[PDB]
Design a protein around this motif. Sequence first.
Motif, mmCIF file in Angstrom:
data_model
loop_
_atom_site.group_PDB
_atom_site.id
_atom_site.type_symbol
_atom_site.label_atom_id
_atom_site.label_comp_id
_atom_site.label_asym_id
_atom_site.label_seq_id
_atom_site.Cartn_x
_atom_site.Cartn_y
_atom_site.Cartn_z
ATOM 1 N N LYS A 201 38.663 2.462 63.879
ATOM 2 C CA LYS A 201 39.200 1.785 65.055
ATOM 3 C C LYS A 201 38.206 0.883 65.785
ATOM 4 O O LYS A 201 37.039 1.242 65.964
ATOM 5 C CB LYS A 201 39.626 2.914 65.966
ATOM 6 C CG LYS A 201 39.977 2.551 67.376
ATOM 7 C CD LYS A 201 40.336 3.828 68.104
ATOM 8 C CE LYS A 201 40.746 3.582 69.540
ATOM 9 N NZ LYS A 201 40.449 4.839 70.308
ATOM 10 N N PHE A 202 38.674 -0.279 66.221
ATOM 11 C CA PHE A 202 37.906 -1.178 67.078
ATOM 12 C C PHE A 202 38.421 -1.229 68.493
ATOM 13 O O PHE A 202 39.603 -1.300 68.702
ATOM 14 C CB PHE A 202 38.043 -2.596 66.575
ATOM 15 C CG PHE A 202 37.227 -2.897 65.359
ATOM 16 C CD1 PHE A 202 35.841 -2.975 65.449
ATOM 17 C CD2 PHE A 202 37.846 -3.143 64.133
ATOM 18 C CE1 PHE A 202 35.087 -3.284 64.331
ATOM 19 C CE2 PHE A 202 37.099 -3.441 63.016
ATOM 20 C CZ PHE A 202 35.727 -3.512 63.125
ATOM 21 N N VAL A 203 37.519 -1.283 69.455
ATOM 22 C CA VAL A 203 37.857 -1.514 70.852
ATOM 23 C C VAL A 203 37.081 -2.736 71.290
ATOM 24 O O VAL A 203 35.851 -2.746 71.261
ATOM 25 C CB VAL A 203 37.432 -0.352 71.761
ATOM 26 C CG1 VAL A 203 37.805 -0.649 73.212
ATOM 27 C CG2 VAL A 203 38.094 0.939 71.319
ATOM 28 N N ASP A 204 37.782 -3.778 71.693
ATOM 29 C CA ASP A 204 37.091 -4.991 72.087
ATOM 30 C C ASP A 204 37.406 -5.304 73.546
ATOM 31 O O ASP A 204 38.526 -5.390 73.932
ATOM 32 C CB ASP A 204 37.459 -6.132 71.154
ATOM 33 C CG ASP A 204 36.667 -7.407 71.439
ATOM 34 O OD1 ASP A 204 36.539 -7.731 72.627
ATOM 35 O OD2 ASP A 204 36.179 -8.076 70.493
ATOM 36 N N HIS A 205 36.385 -5.514 74.343
ATOM 37 C CA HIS A 205 36.565 -5.802 75.773
ATOM 38 C C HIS A 205 36.627 -7.320 75.949
ATOM 39 O O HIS A 205 35.637 -7.927 76.137
ATOM 40 C CB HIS A 205 35.403 -5.151 76.551
ATOM 41 C CG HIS A 205 35.026 -3.773 76.036
ATOM 42 N ND1 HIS A 205 33.965 -3.570 75.162
ATOM 43 C CD2 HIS A 205 35.591 -2.546 76.224
ATOM 44 C CE1 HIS A 205 33.886 -2.286 74.852
ATOM 45 N NE2 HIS A 205 34.860 -1.645 75.478
ATOM 46 N N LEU A 206 37.794 -7.932 75.807
ATOM 47 C CA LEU A 206 37.934 -9.404 75.948
ATOM 48 C C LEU A 206 37.677 -9.897 77.368
ATOM 49 O O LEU A 206 37.980 -9.190 78.341
ATOM 50 C CB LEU A 206 39.326 -9.850 75.519
ATOM 51 C CG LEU A 206 39.508 -9.705 74.007
ATOM 52 C CD1 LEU A 206 40.936 -9.876 73.525
ATOM 53 C CD2 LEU A 206 38.590 -10.693 73.316
ATOM 54 N N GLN A 207 37.106 -11.096 77.513
ATOM 55 C CA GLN A 207 36.864 -11.612 78.874
ATOM 56 C C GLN A 207 38.136 -12.320 79.346
ATOM 57 O O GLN A 207 38.238 -13.505 79.211
ATOM 58 C CB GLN A 207 35.632 -12.524 78.930
ATOM 59 C CG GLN A 207 35.067 -12.693 80.348
ATOM 60 C CD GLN A 207 33.773 -13.505 80.331
ATOM 61 O OE1 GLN A 207 32.811 -13.123 79.676
ATOM 62 N NE2 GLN A 207 33.763 -14.642 81.012
ATOM 63 N N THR A 290 31.888 -8.418 73.112
ATOM 64 C CA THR A 290 31.288 -7.233 72.462
ATOM 65 C C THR A 290 32.397 -6.320 71.972
ATOM 66 O O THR A 290 33.461 -6.288 72.537
ATOM 67 C CB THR A 290 30.427 -6.375 73.430
ATOM 68 O OG1 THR A 290 29.696 -7.223 74.301
ATOM 69 C CG2 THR A 290 29.421 -5.502 72.662
ATOM 70 N N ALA A 291 32.132 -5.528 70.959
ATOM 71 C CA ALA A 291 33.092 -4.519 70.570
ATOM 72 C C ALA A 291 32.414 -3.192 70.287
ATOM 73 O O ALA A 291 31.187 -3.102 70.116
ATOM 74 C CB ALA A 291 33.895 -4.982 69.376
#
Length: 309
Positions: A201-207, A290-291
């Motif tokens: 799983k990936f978690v990406d904090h998009l701006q 970042t992810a």
Amino acid sequence: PTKKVLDENGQSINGKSVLPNATLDYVAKQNFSQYKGIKASAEAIAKGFAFVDQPNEALAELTVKSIKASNGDDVSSLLEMRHVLPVGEFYMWTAKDPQAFYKAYVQKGLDITYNLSFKVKKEFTKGQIKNGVAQIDFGNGYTGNIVVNDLTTPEVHKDVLDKEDGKSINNGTVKLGDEVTYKLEGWVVPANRGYDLFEYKFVDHLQHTHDLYLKDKVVAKVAITLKDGTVIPKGTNLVQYTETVYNKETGRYELAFKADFLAQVSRSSAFGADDFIVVKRIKAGDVYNTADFFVNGNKVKTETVVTHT
């Protein structure tokens, strides 16, 4: 005297790789079955019985989960454990009363099984985890086997591209209203591993103030072989095996493989996926990304990328 290392479903994984949060479950046998019917002299018996376990520098938090004879007897209260600082660091269990232990277990050929578990030290991030045993009967020492497992620390990357299979635009410039594509490079889970996958799983904090999430695409980085023999060609679109969620108020984006699909992957196939996230730039300024990546509960972070508008 023998030692095995076992997975969750009770099967041996000597020689296979494991992840930083592994619990090593060892089963060690003090072998008395070859003494069945013995008539030892009294001075041989008085030299006693001991069992030794020597872990290498990778392993930490010992837990004796049980010590049992093959007839079912819990024998831990007949033994005395010492941790000593076979000539370095090791654990040892000697029988308190040699004579009574000989009569009840040795002369009957009843093996004793030690079930021991350990964690991996956080500062051991590669190399081989090892555990050895020995046994001492009537004063004679016998070594047994060493079980070996590689520790693999996962590793991932992020890039920003103009579009898929295109080129990196990291620290570059992006016109307002244009699209960019974030690429999240997953870890290839190796073949010859000692575990099945339940999480990838990936978690990406998009701006989200500056980037508008449009769409995503997940693709196989390697040919993937399932347990029933089905090959999934490298480059295949894995979308129906995943679940995406995006919260527009926080920027949180998640892409996760379904447990039921990951359970089908063969332990002797590699497994890997790359994720392409398409965004629209809707505001001027500096945009960082970042992810985090999770594989069976192990977390790692990518590098931070930037683009300008």
